[PDB]
């Protein structure tokens, strides 16, 4: 981005699609402590799709890499905190596969 608008609309279109995928459900909002009470001690950079939407809209994502780092961390955080064949991790693999196909579709990583 010396074309910030192209980046913005590309990311917004990407994220709208990611949030539409059925495996995005566990990652739609920040982890509640009433469910995972040590989460925010164990996971020091928590990330979710609501926070990512707020970051997009406030122009946090000035590079594609900042967006991809946060998206990839939604998955890495899941795999660090949850059992590898838990439902949550099942979803994480499904959503990751889907967003890599999208990243590749949008020319955002190599195909």
Author numbering: 727 to 837
Task: Paste lines from the article.
BRDs are evolutionarily conserved and present in diverse nuclear proteins comprising HATs (GCN5, PCAF), ATP-dependent chromatin-remodeling complexes (BAZ1B), helicases (SMARCA), methyltransferases (MLL, ASH1L), transcriptional coactivators (TRIM/TIF1, TAFs) transcriptional mediators (TAF1), nuclear-scaffolding proteins (PB1), and the BET family (Muller et al., 2011).
